[PDB]
Design a protein around this nucleic acid. Structure first.
Ligand SMILES: [Mg+2]
Ligand SMILES: [Mg+2]
Ligand SMILES: [Mg+2]
Ligand SMILES: [Mg+2]
Ligand SMILES: [Mg+2]
Ligand SMILES: [Mg+2]
Ligand SMILES: [Mg+2]
Ligand SMILES: [Mg+2]
Ligand SMILES: [Mg+2]
Ligand SMILES: [Mg+2]
Ligand SMILES: [Mg+2]
Ligand SMILES: [Mg+2]
Ligand SMILES: [Mg+2]
Lengths: 175, 139, 175, 195
RNA sequence: GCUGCGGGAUGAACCGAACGCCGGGUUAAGGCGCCCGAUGCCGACGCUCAUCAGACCCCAGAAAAGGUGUUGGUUGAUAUAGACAGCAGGACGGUGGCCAUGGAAGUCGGAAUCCGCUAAGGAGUGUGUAACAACUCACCUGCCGAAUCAACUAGCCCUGA
């Protein structure tokens, strides 16, 4: 609608990011270690969905040398929910495998099914926190083609930083 | 010595690369390593390919400098590169290599039995010719 | 930057945030050569933070677009302006490159500066890229490639490293 | 089985790399004409490095310790020793499989010699750079057998000419036989299926 | 320390990564001429010849300075109103100017600094005479013929070592 009028256009900055942890365990400052504990990245190659916010971006700026975070696509959300969908009841993470588990545990908010779960993770609604707490942190394998140096940011041809659409390529390599 | 050289308006074979076995034609040299090549009728698109990627031939064309695809095609059809290229031994060598790649086991059996028959006849004739050479050189 | 592979040209426009002290920001525009758009956006923030009172937090990028070549099928001449940082002190530089496209010419510029002057992607700041025509090239290399009916053979052309068998009765000739 | 390699126009490190890789697999390789193996760089530098290699010796007893061969075949054999794991019974068996000769032995006069294209001077070196000859280096330092090896080399070159003239005569005779008639019935099959 | 494992040949601290027993796949740190698993890609661009080449954080060696050895780069200056080089010729008069006496008569020395002929002469760039003399240069002209010169700068290599 804007290029016909000759004007530019900017889309909305998305409110949902995916965070994979890249670096290891030992040799880690407590200032970033506590943020990784709050982002549920206690091991290496685990990922979470983060509701983007000023507080969340100022969290991620502390742990930029340790994570790779980006804007996941619809199938980037969908393959992570289908293929490696693990939830938790109280303890004891169980693979989803049926709509009855989600309808029994998480479905108190009209979110009883996996279509509802994918909709709530992708389009960040008013009940995103319950879905993010229900989802176990996604254990992911090492990528196929490899990684780029793991220490410099993606601006410097590295891995530890923001890439904003290339995390879709990263999740097609890893997942 | 140095019968061939790159030139504005020379057809060239392509040995290595994604367009192998396809003739291109040099339009102009960019800088020392790559030349803007073009293909009017050899199913290859106008691009820049390296000199070590291409292979020089002997036939030349009267291209103007940086002419259109239309003028390249007109000079190609005026020079008649396709029939004259089929009517040489080098394309017969490439065609024989392709036919050896496209052999089968029954074809190899026929080649081997014809090979046995020809080599027996050649061996008998070489024996007869050296016997005749000794009979000629004996007086 | 990394300058990995061939480079790409991006038109990036960016402005400040709309503030009640001063609305309608001037919406500046730059031409960034970068391997992808994320590095283009970051290098845009770098140059505009050098030039004017701008940063990533108090500003935004309106549009970041790929700039395709106006004539890829034409062998053209490009003058590149350089602000490279050497070991002792930084220096300005004018270079000339005969190549097809602008992104390929700037790619050859990065590769050639890294070859001769040991300049990384950290130190090279492309000031301006401009297509120049014939009879304006300052350089003798591009001036001697300016030849109609140009002739040269390829003497001593050796190739096919072990594509042939490693052990043969041949003794391979050149040209 | 056996891989009889030429040495005329090859490089020391490249030929040693290819021989030391192909001798661990079991192919019994023999490098003949070892006096003609070229070495890149300047000849003064090559003999200076070889003089430093001679200077490296044990001071308490030079016999019990560093041995320094002067013959070029043993130079190449030491070059392949320094690349194979000769302190174990894999590289030791590989050096037992490897045979090296200066000049050309009488079985290798008859057997055909191979030429490695990956180790050639023309393929690997720029033609305006300096080089050396390992036989020239060996005659300059130690190996006093250039005048005998060159004489026997000229003798076998004369033998190779007097064999090649007969071979070319027989090739002319068999191509006269191929020029003759009544062989084309099989050629109708053969030219179609790759003459 | 209290800690194995993969690289750094070898290693307490380095770089990844932390350890129940195994199979399959993948990867980091690192590497793909042979040891020693992997570039045996018809890999791309350019630099380097080193008579002590060079080869990966800690890490196991080196500086100030110099190079008409090559490669870029900046600032300038010349040139058909025929330049830079080369070969040849001119290179004066006032005036052996002036302070100087052992001498300066352009040439140890201090201050200066103009005109005529002009094709051009600088009260003179150097060699030489104790000085007087000869030679050469700034500048000009004869032949040739279109690109040339100067000062800085940084990459490899060399001397310094
Ligand atoms: Mg660490
Ligand atoms: Mg793989
Ligand atoms: Mg890596
Ligand atoms: Mg670190
Ligand atoms: Mg203790
Ligand atoms: Mg502890
Ligand atoms: Mg180790
Ligand atoms: Mg070490
Ligand atoms: Mg395993
Ligand atoms: Mg191997
Ligand atoms: Mg020490
Ligand atoms: Mg220099
Ligand atoms: Mg040095």
């Amino acid at each position: 609608m804007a290029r016909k009028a000759g004007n530019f256009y900017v889309p909305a900055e998305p409110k949902l990011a995916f965070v994979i942890r890249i670096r290891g365990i030992n040799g880690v400052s407590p200032k970033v270690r506590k943020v990784l504990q709050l982002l549920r990245l206690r091991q290496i190659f685990n990922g979470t969905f983060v509701k983007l916010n000023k507080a969340s971006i100022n969290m991620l700026r502390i742990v930029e040398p340790y994570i790779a975070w980006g804007y996941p696509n619809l199938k980037s959300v969908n393959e992570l929910i289908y293929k490696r969908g693990y939830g938790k009841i109280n303890k004891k993470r169980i693979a989803l495998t049926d709509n009855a588990l989600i309808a029994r545990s998480l479905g108190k908010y009209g979110i009883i099914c996996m279509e509802d779960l994918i909709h709530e993770i992708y389009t960040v609604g008013k009940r995103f926190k319950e879905a993010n707490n229900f989802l176990w942190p996604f254990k992911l394998s090492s990528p196929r083609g490899g990684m780029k140096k793991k220490t410099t940011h993606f601006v410097e041809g590295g891995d530890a930083g923001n890439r904003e659409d290339q995390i879709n390529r990263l999740i097609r390599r890893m997942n | 010595v140095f019968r061939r050289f790159v030139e504005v308006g020379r057809v060239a074979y392509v040995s290595f690369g994604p367009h192998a076995g396809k003739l291109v034609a040099i339009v102009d040299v960019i800088d020392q390593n790559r030349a803007l090549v073009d293909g009017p009728c050899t199913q290859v698109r106008r691009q820049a390919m390296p000199f070590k990627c291409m292979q020089l031939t002997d036939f030349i064309l009267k291209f103007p400098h940086s002419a259109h695809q239309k003028y390249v095609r007109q000079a190609w059809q005026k020079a008649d590169i396709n029939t004259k290229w089929a009517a040489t031994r080098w394309a017969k060598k490439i065609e024989a290599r392709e036919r050896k790649a496209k052999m089968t086991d029954f074809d190899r059996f026929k080649v081997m039995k014809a090979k046995k028959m020809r080599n027996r006849i050649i061996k008998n004739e070489v024996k007869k010719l050296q016997k005749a050479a000794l009979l000629k050189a004996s007086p | 930057m990394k300058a990995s592979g061939t480079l790409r040209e991006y038109k990036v426009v960016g402005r400040c945030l709309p503030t009640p002290k001063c609305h309608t920001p001037p919406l500046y525009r730059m031409r960034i050569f970068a391997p992808n758009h994320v590095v283009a956006k970051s290098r845009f923030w770098y140059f505009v933070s050098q030039l004017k009172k701008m940063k990533k937090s108090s500003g935004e990028i309106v549009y970041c677009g790929q700039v395709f070549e106006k004539s890829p099928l034409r062998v053209k001449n490009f003058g590149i302006w350089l602000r490279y940082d050497s070991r002792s002190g930084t220096h300005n530089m004018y270079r000339e490159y005969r190549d097809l496209t602008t992104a390929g010419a700037v790619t050859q510029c990065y590769r050639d500066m890294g070859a001769r002057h040991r300049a990384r992607a950290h130190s090279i700041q492309i000031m301006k890229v401009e297509e120049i025509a014939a009879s304006k090239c300052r350089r003798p290399a591009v001036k001697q490639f300016h030849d109609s009916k140009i002739k040269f053979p390829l003497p001593h052309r050796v190739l096919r490293r072990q594509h042939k068998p490693r052990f043969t009765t041949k003794r391979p000739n050149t040209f | 089985q056996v891989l009889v390699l030429d040495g005329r126009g090859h490089l020391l490190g490249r030929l040693a790399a290819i021989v030391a890789k192909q001798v661990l697999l079991g192919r019994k390789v023999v490098v003949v004409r070892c006096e003609g193996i070229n070495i890149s760089g300047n000849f003064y530098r090559n003999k200076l490095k070889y003089l430093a290699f001679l200077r490296k010796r044990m001071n308490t007893n030079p016999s019990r310790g560093p041995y320094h061969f002067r013959a070029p075949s043993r130079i190449f054999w030491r070059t392949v020793r320094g690349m194979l794991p000769h302190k174990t019974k894999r590289g030791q068996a590989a050096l037992d499989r490897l045979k090296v000769f200066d000049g050309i032995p009488p079985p290798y006069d008859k057997k055909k010699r191979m030429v490695v294209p990956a180790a050639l001077k023309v393929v690997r070196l720029k033609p305006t750079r300096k080089f050396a000859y390992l036989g020239r280096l060996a005659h300059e330092v130690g190996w006093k057998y250039q005048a005998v090896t060159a004489t026997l080399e000229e003798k076998r070159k004369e033998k190779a000419k007097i064999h090649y003239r007969k071979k070319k005569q027989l090739m002319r005779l068999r191509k006269q036989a191929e020029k003759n008639v009544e062989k084309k019935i099989d050629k109708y099959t053969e030219v179609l299926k790759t003459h």
